[PDB]
């Protein structure tokens, strides 16, 4: 009934970077949180950025600050990943969350995508 | 950052033979924390949730428990598709962070 | 028209009588001075405000961070006892209408909307660049927005006054406090009423002036 | 009332202080009235009339001040009626739509007592 | 239909109970409990306590302590009631000593008598206790936020004085707080909204 | 500015200095009095005032006969001899022109146009809603609007003052009136110079009050 959909990879070059889609269906969407996570195939976690779906009130961490940017959209119910100026170094599997009222939780998941980047 | 500590980050384990890991955090986080499981296929699930509590639809034999000062993961029986990657998460203050995690090994010849 | 001089500037003002005291004080001396190192009104970038503009806040000395003489000895002393003059000023036309609720909340502690997550350090200090309210009828700290007005406050109304000066003295439990940690006071922009005019959108500028007036500094270091 | 709601019998003198947010050149008047406790609440405006009231206008004074004489309550008496005088005018340049803010506080005769718990868990 | 009591000091103070725990006790062939005696955890005291920011008080603690049955009849056991100020580190080598230190106050008391009532005075380092703190634990930049180090009263720890008794009686014990001499400045407006969690200000809505 | 108040209420006014006295006097009494019972101003319904507003009119006391508190003692009583204190206060921008001549004719005998027949009682006494001038240039008794300035009557110039103050003495050859019968004075509301404004057409309200002031009652019944 509900689920989480990020299909696909999208391999780009350094100059410009796509932009991540993340739908939902199953629960309302203007009542939940939205998350994001980074997997590295360094075996690296390191955690993106949350944006509430109300509000554009977003938090971003102090490495990935100025980088990445969060925006969404209650019509179509999906939340979308804003980056500029992706080099060779970064490359991993983006992943969204939910969370909610109680215990912001991380329960469903994405599918997650291939990002591969060469000069 | 605060830094949420994993240890060990590898073990060796045959079927059976429950083993607790513990993770440590430089500031209290209260009972806020999250444990998640990670398959080689890239899908991530959650397993244990604010200590005691655990996942509707997820067998009884994960567990965990708090001494106070640490937080452990406690599995009873393990399996052959036991062997991910655990990690330790603490949503109670932004920003988020990832413990070190552990690979669960076989033991072979 | 009166001309308030502080220092070696000053700024073209309303006429000032009976400004409001917070809670019926001035900040006097704990029973060197910075009358004139760290002295004259530092004014802030002003915000465009419009009629979806849910407000803004500006906690202290957080704007301060580092701003002009003041950002040097943030850094640079151990403790300090700071009192705040805060002038307000919005211009504006006559043709314009709506109202701004210039109120002072000392520690106001911030809050989420639907989730148990603290914010985080950059969340909360934000620097000179300031937040924006969140759901400024919640203030953001769980309470409501009617019974706020316990706080010092003034009105800022495009028909009678369009400026508004607050004077906070130093307000903590200890003598002294930490420069880059705790926050005494915050200074809060509230528009009750939004704009409205003929033309479908307008901007109305906004200007803060903030005088660490009658402080002190201690543990002399670097 | 936050406060009163940790108390039960309440006694005193309230007031009411009516604040006009809208433009500069906003035309027109309008009334104000208070209803006796079992006071026959207006249909439209003469009975409103019989009792305490006043003529307020934008142009000239840019608040109210009402001073309601001694309300009482414990554990439909009261009321507070509104109505337009003229019509509102404004040019054309303002703004069609303004507002207001109301406002209430406590006299020096306001008194409180009888300790409870609030009603309110949340 | 138709100033004394509105004081502050009558107002805040009123005997409510902050700390309902009941250890299970039938056959152990252990038995304590420490909490950090806070107000944000009973709701109404909270609440009753958000309305002003800094107050000043002496906390007034009383232990009442019943015994439920799970005809054998009640024994008298002892208990112990420490007050462990902040700052003692609790290496905790249970059946030997730290509990008898001479350091903490402690109090005796039996099932049948008076409930055991104390007064702890006012310890801090400033002025008066925060009630919001606007700022970071310590300073670790990044260190917790919406808890001040500055302010801790203690940890009560409460024991049986008795070893095991072979009874299957449950011992439930409740602790009442009153203020005295309470001093109240800046009041705040009240929170309508639910309170999420203990730690912080969030809000749902 | 100056709120003028008379019994439990009152209404917001311009300054009011050098008010005008009909005939140079004022309504002493005569050589229980209302100052509690019928008192406080009666504010009458506002007329919606166009470019092609003729006028209104409205009798003394035609337009109290059941007005408030001041209703009852109409049919209640036998005699009477009351004064009359009328400020109209018309509300408008800068933006709009014209004039408003505020004149109170004592004795004022109506007539038709191109008839013999007298009116009748109903189109005499109209009560609170008022009349509307059918010629006012005539004045509708067949004088001269020219020489009706030799009346007491005050000027609204939308340049200069908004409002008028009229009072108005016990003018009659006996000393006590019928309440449903004579009408002593007449109010009536001149628009020499009509509205004009950049829009075809607008409105503009007029506030009409009227104070009984230093009256008297006699023959008790009902």
């Known amino acids: 009934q509900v689920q989480l959909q990020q299909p696909g990879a999208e391999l780009v070059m350094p100059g410009a970077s796509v932009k991540m889609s993340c739908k939902a269906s199953?629960?309302?969407?203007?009542?939940?949180?939205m998350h994001w996570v980074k997997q590295r195939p360094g075996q690296g976690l390191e955690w993106i950025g949350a944006?509430?779906?109300?509000?554009?009130?977003?938090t971003y961490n102090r490495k990935f600050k100025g980088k990445a940017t969060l925006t969404v959209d209650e019509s179509s119910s999906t939340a979308y990943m804003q980056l500029i100026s992706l080099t060779s170094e970064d490359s991993a599997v983006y992943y969204c969350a939910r969370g909610g009222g109680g215990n912001s939780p991380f329960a469903y998941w994405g599918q997650g995508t291939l990002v591969t980047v060469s000069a | 950052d605060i830094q949420m500590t994993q240890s060990p980050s590898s073990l060796s384990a045959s079927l059976g033979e429950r083993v607790s890991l513990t993770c440590r955090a430089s500031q209290d986080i209260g009972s806020s924390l999250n444990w998640l499981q990670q398959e080689p296929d890239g899908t991530i699930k959650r397993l244990i949730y604010?200590?005691?509590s655990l996942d509707s639809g997820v067998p009884k034999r994960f567990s965990g428990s708090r001494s106070g000062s640490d937080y452990s993961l406690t599995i009873s029986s393990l399996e052959s598709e036991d062997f991910v990657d655990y990690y330790c998460?603490?949503?109670?203050?932004?920003?988020?962070?990832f413990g070190a995690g552990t690979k669960l090994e076989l033991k072979r010849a | 028209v009166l001309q308030l001089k502080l220092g070696n500037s000053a700024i073209v003002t309303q006429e000032a009588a009976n400004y409001c005291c917070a809670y019926g004080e001035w900040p006097n001396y704990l029973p060197t001075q910075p009358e004139t190192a760290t002295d004259r009104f530092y004014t802030l970038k002003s915000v465009k405000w419009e009629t979806g503009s849910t407000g803004w806040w500006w906690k202290l000395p957080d704007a301060l961070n580092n701003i002009g003489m003041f950002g040097q000895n943030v850094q640079h002393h151990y403790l300090y006892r700071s009192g705040f003059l805060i002038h307000v000023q919005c211009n504006a036309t006559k043709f314009h209408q709506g109202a701004l609720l210039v109120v002072a909340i000392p520690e106001h502690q911030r809050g989420a909307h639907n989730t148990n997550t603290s914010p985080g350090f950059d969340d909360i200090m934000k620097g000179e660049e300031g937040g924006t309210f969140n759901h400024p009828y919640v203030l953001d700290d769980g309470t409501s927005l009617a019974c706020a007005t316990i706080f010092p406050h003034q009105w800022i109304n495009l028909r009678t006054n369009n400026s508004a000066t607050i004077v906070l003295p130093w307000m903590n439990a200890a003598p002294m406090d930490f420069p880059l940690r705790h926050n005494q006071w915050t200074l809060a922009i509230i528009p009750v009423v939004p704009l409205g005019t003929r033309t479908t959108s307008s901007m109305v500028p906004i200007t803060v002036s903030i005088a660490p007036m009658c402080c002190e500094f201690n543990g002399l270091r670097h | 009332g936050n406060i009163s709601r940790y108390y039960t019998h309440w006694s005193g003198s309230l007031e009411m202080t009516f604040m006009f947010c809208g433009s500069f050149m906003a035309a027109g008047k309008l009334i104000l009235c208070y209803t006796p406790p079992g006071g026959s609440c207006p249909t439209t405006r003469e009975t409103a009339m019989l009792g305490t009231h006043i003529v307020w206008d934008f142009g000239l004074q840019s608040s109210v001040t009402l001073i309601i004489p001694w309300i009482s309550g414990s554990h439909n008496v009261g009321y507070v009626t509104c109505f337009m005088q003229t019509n509102l005018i404004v040019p054309s340049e303002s703004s069609d739509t303004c507002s207001l803010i109301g406002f209430i506080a406590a006299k020096d005769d306001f008194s409180l007592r009888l300790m409870r718990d609030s009603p309110d868990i949340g | 239909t138709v100033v004394s009591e509105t004081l502050v000091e009558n107002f805040l103070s009123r005997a409510a109970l902050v700390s309902k725990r009941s250890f299970e006790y039938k056959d152990h062939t252990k038995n304590f409990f420490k909490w950090t005696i806070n107000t944000r955890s009973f709701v109404q005291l909270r609440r009753k306590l958000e309305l002003f920011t800094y107050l000043r008080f002496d906390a007034e603690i009383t232990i009442l302590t019943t015994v439920a049955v799970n005809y054998v009849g009640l024994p008298d056991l002892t208990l112990q009631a420490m007050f462990v100020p902040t700052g003692a580190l609790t290496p905790e080598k249970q059946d030997s000593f730290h509990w008898q230190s001479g350091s903490n106050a402690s109090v005796f008391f039996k099932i049948s008598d008076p409930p055991a009532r104390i007064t702890i005075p006012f310890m801090c380092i400033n002025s008066a206790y925060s009630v919001f703190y606007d700022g970071f634990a310590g300073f670790e930049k990044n260190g917790l936020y919406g808890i001040n180090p500055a302010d801790t009263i203690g940890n009560l720890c409460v024991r049986i004085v008795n070893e095991h008794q072979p009874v299957g009686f449950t011992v439930t014990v409740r602790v009442y707080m009153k203020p005295k001499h309470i001093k109240a400045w800046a009041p705040r407006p009240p929170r309508t909204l639910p309170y999420m969690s203990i730690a912080n200000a969030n809000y749902k809505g | 500015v100056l709120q003028l108040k008379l019994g439990n209420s009152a209404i917001v006014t311009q300054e009011a200095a050098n008010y005008c006295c009909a005939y140079g006097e004022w309504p002493n009494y005569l050589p229980t009095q209302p100052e509690t019972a019928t008192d406080r101003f009666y504010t009458l319904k506002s007329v919606k005032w166009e470019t092609g507003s003729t006028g209104w009119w409205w009798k003394l006391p035609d337009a109290l006969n059941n007005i408030g508190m001041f209703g009852q003692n109409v049919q209640h009583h036998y005699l009477y001899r009351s004064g009359f204190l009328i400020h109209v206060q018309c509300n408008a921008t800068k933006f709009h022109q014209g004039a408003l001549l505020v004149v109170a004719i004592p004795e004022h005998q109506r007539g038709a146009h191109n008839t013999n027949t007298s009116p009748g009682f109903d189109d005499i006494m109209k009560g609170e809603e008022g009349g509307t001038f059918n010629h006012p240039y005539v004045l509708d008794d067949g004088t001269s609007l020219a020489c009706a300035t030799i009346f007491p009557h005050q000027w609204i110039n939308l340049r200069t003052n908004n409002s008028a103050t009229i009072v108005l003495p016990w003018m009659n050859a006996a000393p006590m009136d019928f309440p449903l019968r004579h009408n002593q004075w007449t109010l009536a509301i001149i628009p020499v110079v009509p509205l004009g404004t950049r829009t075809t057409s607008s409105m503009v309200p007029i506030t009409v009050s009227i104070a009984p002031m230093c009256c008297e009652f006699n023959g008790l019944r009902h």
């Open positions: 998460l603490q949503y109670a203050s932004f920003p988020l962070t």
């Open positions: 199953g629960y309302t969407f203007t009542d939940y949180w």
């Open positions: 944006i509430d779906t109300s509000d554009s009130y977003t």
């Open positions: 604010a200590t005691s």
